Amino acid sequence: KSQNLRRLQAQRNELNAKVRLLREELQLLQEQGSYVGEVVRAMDKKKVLVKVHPEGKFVVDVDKNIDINDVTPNCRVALRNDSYTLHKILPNKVDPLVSLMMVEKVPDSTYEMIGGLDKQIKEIKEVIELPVKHPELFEALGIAQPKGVLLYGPPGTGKTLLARAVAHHTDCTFIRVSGSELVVRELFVMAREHAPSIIFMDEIDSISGGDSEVQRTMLELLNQLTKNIKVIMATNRIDILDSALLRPGRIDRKIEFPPPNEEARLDILKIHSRKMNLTRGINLRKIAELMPGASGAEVKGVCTEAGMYALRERRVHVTQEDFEMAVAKVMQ
């Protein structure tokens, strides 16, 4: 009876604690609201040098139960409620590059679905994960360092996707400085922090000193250089670029992308056709029959258009002929 009575004591004390923090909860919410902001990190006795959201600066203190030793720069959390003194830490809130990756969301996760390129992936995997994950045979083979790969090919067919895929089999990173819209030399710090990184470029001539300037601008810092960062430049033509890049070896690797032949186009059209429903049998060769100058894209386009040409008749299986009017449509 006393044991069961103390079980009832546990029930009554639990409900009484509920009414504790509800009662002092309704008197509690009459207090203040802490601010929030990124910082440049401390130097001295307490210290922060914050920059709060509306107006970006102050130097504040830190409470006893905060252990100013771990709170590192660009890791926003604050509480200087009224007098301006810290309390605790919050969600790291995605650092800088997390921004220009998710923002330029251009890079689309890719892995091994490259449509019939094996010499190309043998050569880029020869010079993009051997200088990262096995440096030991380079520091005993007498080689200094391989860095910088130029991807010249037709528009399409290997760009932004080979340099994506072998960047993420290796789980390296994939920084793209293609375009300078909203923010050089500061990017190197981010790459250095990542430790290992891969920088990618832009290819515009048609689908004066565009991005060969930054290209070398980071080969000047990259030549003497905290070492496993590998620039990648994609261009449509090898002849259009600078004579300064024509400086063997400034581009330790000139990988070549041909336009796809018959069987490689049945491989890429095999994969993009592995995106959807078809039927009991296609025998995809007749579509590849007129592949003649095609392009990587010229394959994703016709497979989506074959899907839509199956969608127009409210039909749930992509037949043979929707391919034939897809590739027979896009000859424009």
Residues of the shown chain interacting with ligand ADP in the complex, contacts defined by CB under 6 A: 113-117, 155-161, 234, 247, 268, 296-297, 300
* Residues 160, 163, 167, 168, CA torsion sign: positive
Q: Which part of the chain contacts another protein (CB under 8 A), choosing from 17-25, 186-194, 197-205, 301-309? A: 186-194
| CA gap 46, 67 in Å, rounded | 10
State yes or no: 1 annotated in a binding site.
no
Partner from another protein, ligand ADP, none contacting 26, C-beta within 5 to 8 A by type: none
Is residue 291 a contact partner of residue 260, using CB atoms and an 8 Å limit? yes
> What secondary structure, in 3-state letters, does 298-332 show?
HHHHHHHHHHHHHHCCCCCCCCCHHHHHHHCCCCC
For 237-273, b/e burial (b = at least 16 CB within 10 A) is eeeebeeebeeeebbbbebebebbeeebbbbbbbbbb
Name the residue among 221, 108, 217, 203 with its Cα closest to residue 150.
203
What does the DSSP 8-state code read for residue 258?
Answer: P
Among residues 8, 10, 29, 144, the one that binds another protein under rule CB under 8 A: 144
Name the residue among 108, 105, 74 with its Cα closest to residue 90.
74
**Closer Cβ to another protein, 89 or 225, answer by number:** 225
> What's the closest the beta carbon of residue 174 comes to another protein, in angstroms?
21
Query: Three-state DSSP class for 272?
Result: helix
**Closer Cβ to another protein, 87 or 250, answer by number:** 250
**Closer Cβ to ligand ADP, 78 or 233, answer by number:** 233
The answer to whether 179 contacts another protein (rule: CB under 8 A) is no
Partner from another protein, ligand ADP, none contacting 140, C-beta within 5 to 8 A by type: another protein
Query: Contact letters (x/-) for another protein, 45-84, by CB under 8 A?
Result: ----x-----xxxxxxx------------------x--xx
Site residues, another protein (CB under 8 A):
40, 43, 49, 55-61, 80, 83-84, 126-127, 137, 140-144, 146, 180, 185-186, 188-189, 208-209, 213-214, 216-217, 220-221, 223-226, 243-244, 247-250, 252
Binding residues for ATP: 153-160
